[PDB]
């Protein structure tokens, strides 16, 4: 396939280093300049570095000059960015990109610069009930609390259930840990017979939780 695939970001101590990689397939890599661009959480795109065909020539944004080094292994179709003396202002998703009459972009990789510790989330059910039900459909979910750093990914029924899912953006709690809920709307009439499981993945801590979310038992409802 024509593709760029990145890897190598993660949590890094201020002052520390990372090497990012970007593997190309599907086009003649050696014929194009290649570039790194970053995007801080919630903000715009800024260019970080460009490298000539054969690595003979490299250019850098003034904020990274002296700290980051772009390079490429053409025979292995790979772009790298060596990042040293990482600061907090370097926290961003990093993309690699080919810029041409058609673009090719990597999928991005988050680099979080912080001395705070990794912590996995606790996952709690948001059980559906008559208080989460309106004319035929019921809302239910999972609360994913107290994790660091981003991201958590959440799916439902191991990826089989996608329709009607809203996974909210993480909020930073004043404790300095993130929290989010993911909720789903489903037919109320078959809460008794269909299983709902939210599958929470926190890669930074290799935490994987599968929480079954079961309907609340109610008696304070019309008899029947």
């Amino acid at each position: 396939q024509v593709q760029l695939v990145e890897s190598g970001g993660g949590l890094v101590q201020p002052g520390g280093s990372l090497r990012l990689s970007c593997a190309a397939s599907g086009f003649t890599f050696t014929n194009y300049y290649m570039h790194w661009v970053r995007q801080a959480p919630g903000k715009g795109l800024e260019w970080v570095s460009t490298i000539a065909y054969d690595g003979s020539s490299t250019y850098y944004a003034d904020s990274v000059k002296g700290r980051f080094t772009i390079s490429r292994d053409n025979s292995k179709n790979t772009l790298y960015l060596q990042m040293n003396s990482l600061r907090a202002e370097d926290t961003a998703v990093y993309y690699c990109a080919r810029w041409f009459t058609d673009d090719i972009w990597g999928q991005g990789t988050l680099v979080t610069v912080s001395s705070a510790s990794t912590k996995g989330p606790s996952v709690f059910p948001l059980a559906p009930s008559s208080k989460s039900t309106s004319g035929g459909t019921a809302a239910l979910g999972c609360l994913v609390k107290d994790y660091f750093p981003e991201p958590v990914t959440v799916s439902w029924n191991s990826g089989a259930l996608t329709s009607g899912v809203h996974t909210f953006p993480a909020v930073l709690q004043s404790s300095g840990l993130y929290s989010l809920s993911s909720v789903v709307t489903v037919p109320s009439s078959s809460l008794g017979t269909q299983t709902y499981i939210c599958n929470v993945n926190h890669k930074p801590s290799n935490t994987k939780v599968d929480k079954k979310v079961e309907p609340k038992s109610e008696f304070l409802v019309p008899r029947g």
Partner: protein
Amino acid sequence: DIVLTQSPATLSLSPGERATLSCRASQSISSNELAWYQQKPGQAPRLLIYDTSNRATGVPARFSGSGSGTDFTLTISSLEPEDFAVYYCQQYYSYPITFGQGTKVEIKRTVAAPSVFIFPPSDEQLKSGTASVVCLLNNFYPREAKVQWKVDNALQSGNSQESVTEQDSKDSTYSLSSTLTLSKADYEKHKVYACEVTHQGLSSPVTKSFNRGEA
């Protein structure tokens, strides 16, 4: 260095209308080295136009770009709901390569009232010392919405946070969570927990509530 000032910073239009996006450069981009990008949430930017006016592969013809020297324009002549995104211009006539700060395009639709749901804390969470109470506002439009927590009818303050989804790509709706966090001890001091919602699509404010330890 070439600084790109994009205007307006945000734009809200109905499907069918035409969006006009401006990208002003701080000096004349001599050859036509300007590109436009579209970016949707969780995604890489997507090339739309390059060399100022050339449309890129598989870009719908409603997107087109114009300009030169100093002012450039991106026109989206007949907007769809799927066109909600941030749009960026970039310059590749001089280093540093630079981008505008973007135009965030919001897609208007008819008023839709939120469905409002409330979830008591789980027993599981309670074992550990804290109670989270979640009020969900689902699939509403416009974005503006007020949510207030009452505990035994006393207005809470400073102990909740809100989070909102990005506009839906098909129906143009938002959903919003409001999470009330309390210690287990505080939670157990009070009985009625209520989320009050105000929104244009509601006839008057809607309160959803439960009593601690019912079912």
